[PDB]
Every structure is written in structure tokens, then in C-alpha cells.
A paper describes a structure:
A hallmark of all motile M. xanthus cells is the accumulation of MglA-GTP at the leading pole where it activates motility, while MglA-GDP is found diffusely in the cytosol. This localization pattern arises due to the GAP activity of MglB, which is located at the lagging pole where it inactivates MglA-GTP and depletes it from this pole. The ability of MglA to hydrolyze GTP is essential for motility regulation. To gain insight into the structural landscape of M. xanthus MglA, we determined the crystal structures of MglA in different nucleotide states, which uncovered that MglA can adopt three conformations: inactive MglA-GDP, active MglA-GTPγS, whose structure had not been determined before, and an unusual conformation combining inactive and active features.
The structure of unbound MglA-GTP is currently unknown, leaving open the question of whether the substantial remodeling at switch 1 and switch 2 is solely due to GTP or is promoted by MglB. Binding of GTPγS induces a twisted three-residue register shift of switch 1 and remodels switch 2 to create space for the γ-phosphate, as seen in MglA in the T. thermophilus MglA-MglB complex. Displacement of switch 2 also allows Mg2+ to bind with an incomplete coordination that lacks the conserved Mg2+-binding threonine (Thr54) located in the arginine finger loop. Accordingly, the MglB-sensitive MglA-GTP species is likely represented by the MglA-GTPγS structure, in which both switch regions are in active conformations similar to those seen in the MglA/MglB complex (this study, 12).
Numbering used by the authors: 2 to 194
């Protein structure tokens, strides 16, 4: 987080992580579409001249408040396909909370596990610890006939029983619940230290 004690402004960063095509961008699109105009900024895509179609997303929002400050949450996604580790590492810098978006399709379980381990490693490689940071897991794509059962998703991907939400990101199932859960965890940490 960045706290400016003179201007009384706090900026928090939430990163949506997970394997290729798992639903990260779709989460932010639904959040943008369904949030009141007065509490959201603009959802934008970003890429660079070096790889102009390697897109990730940025969306600023007003969620909860810390008394005596203006607090804004900046939501980011990452490029989840395996090759793009360097991009994921750039985006994770300064993260305050993480949402791991798992693709419930059975064919994508290995990719879910690879991406979750990559999250843990990348957090360690910038001095963070996944076990301590505000962190919520989303089991997305619950609508698909090849989705793994929720119990099996939990046993495979949520060994520490952190908060978990079923989702269908394009229709909004679970999307705001996931966001509000991680944002509350981040705010609680701000109020602590
Ligand atoms: N059936 C179904 N399709 C979904 C769901 N969530 C996302 N999708 C679809 O999956 C595809 C990829 O979603 P997207 O949100 O773009 O992935 P991403 O995680 O951002 O992917 P990347 O940028 O790391 S490669 C899209 O076609 C989107 O509509 C879901 O819950 N159910
Ligand atoms: Mg995307």
C-alpha cells in the first residue's frame, strides 16, 4: 500500500492471478459494468510496444473506508499463460491482496496448480509470503459440465481453508463476494499496522 499522511490518501493494490484464460479479465469487466458510476474509475487494458497484444487490466474503485483517509483500491490482472512470468512479476510488486481465479474445468487442473505454485514463488521472490497476505480463492466456470466438484477444488487448491467462492464470472455469480472478501481483509490489515 501507499499511504500519504499529508494528503490523507491510501492506495491499495489487488492482483487477480491464475492460469491462462481462467476468467481474471472477465471478473474485472463484470465489476466495472455493475459498479455504480460514483465509486469506480475506468477499466483499462495495458500492454507495451514490445508486445502490444500482451494485455492486462487496471480498474480503480472505492470500497471500504479507513477513517480520516481517502482509500482507493487498484485492481490488476496478469497474463496467466505460462510463458509470461516476467509480466506477472512486474504486476505483483506492491500487492496488498490477491484473488486466485481457478478454472474449474477438469482439463485445467494442472494449469491451476502450476499457476498457484507460481504465485507462491513469485511472492517469495519479492519478499512476500502467500500464507500471510490477504488472499481469497475463486472457483470460476461453475457453469461448465466438465467442472470439477467444489469439494475436489477445495481439496486440490485450498489446503489452508482460506476464503473461497464459487463463480461464473460472465454472469456475475460470486464476483462481488470475492472482491468484497479480499478488500475487507486488506482494510483490516491497514487498520492494524
Ligand atoms: N463458461 C464460462 N466461460 C468463462 C467464465 N469465465 C470466463 N470465461 C471465458 O473464458 C475466456 C477467457 O476469460 P478471460 O477473463 O479473458 O481470461 P483471463 O484469465 O483474463 O486470461 P489471460 O488474460 O490470463 S490469457 C473468455 O472467453 C471468457 O468469456 C465462466 O465462468 N464460464
Ligand atoms: Mg486477461
Amino acid at each position: 500500500s501507499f499511504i500519504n499522511y499529508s494528503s490523507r490518501e491510501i492506495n491499495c493494490k489487488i492482483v487477480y492471478y491464475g492460469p491462462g484464460l481462467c476468467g481474471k479479465t472477465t471478473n474485472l469487466q463484470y465489476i466495472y459494468n455493475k459498479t455504480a458510476a460514483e465509486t469506480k474509475g475506468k477499466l483499462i487494458s495495458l500492454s507495451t510496444e514490445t508486445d502490444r497484444t500482451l494485455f492486462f487490466d487496471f480498474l480503480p474503485l472505492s470500497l471500504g473506508e479507513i477513517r480520516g483517509f481517502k482509500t482507493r483500491f487498484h485492481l490488476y490482472t496478469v497474463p496467466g499463460q505460462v510463458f509470461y512470468d516476467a509480466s506477472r512479476k512486474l504486476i505483483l510488486k506492491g500487492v496488498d491482496g490477491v484473488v486466485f481465479v481457478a478454472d474449474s474445468q477438469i482439463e485445467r487442473m494442472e494449469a491451476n496448480m502450476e499457476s498457484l505454485e507460481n504465485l507462491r514463488i513469485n511472492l517469495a521472490e519479492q519478499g512476500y509470503d502467500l500464507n500471510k497476505i490477504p488472499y481469497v480463492i475463486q472457483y470460476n466456470k461453475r457453469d461448465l459440465p466438465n467442472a470439477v466438484t467444489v469439494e475436489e477444488m477445495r481439496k486440490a487448491l485450498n489446503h489452508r481453508n482460506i476464503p473461497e467462492y464459487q463463480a461464473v464470472a460472465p454472469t456475475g455469480v460470486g464476483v462481488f463476494d470475492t472482491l468484497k472478501a479480499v478488500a475487507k481483509l486488506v482494510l483490516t490489515e491497514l487498520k492494524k499496522g
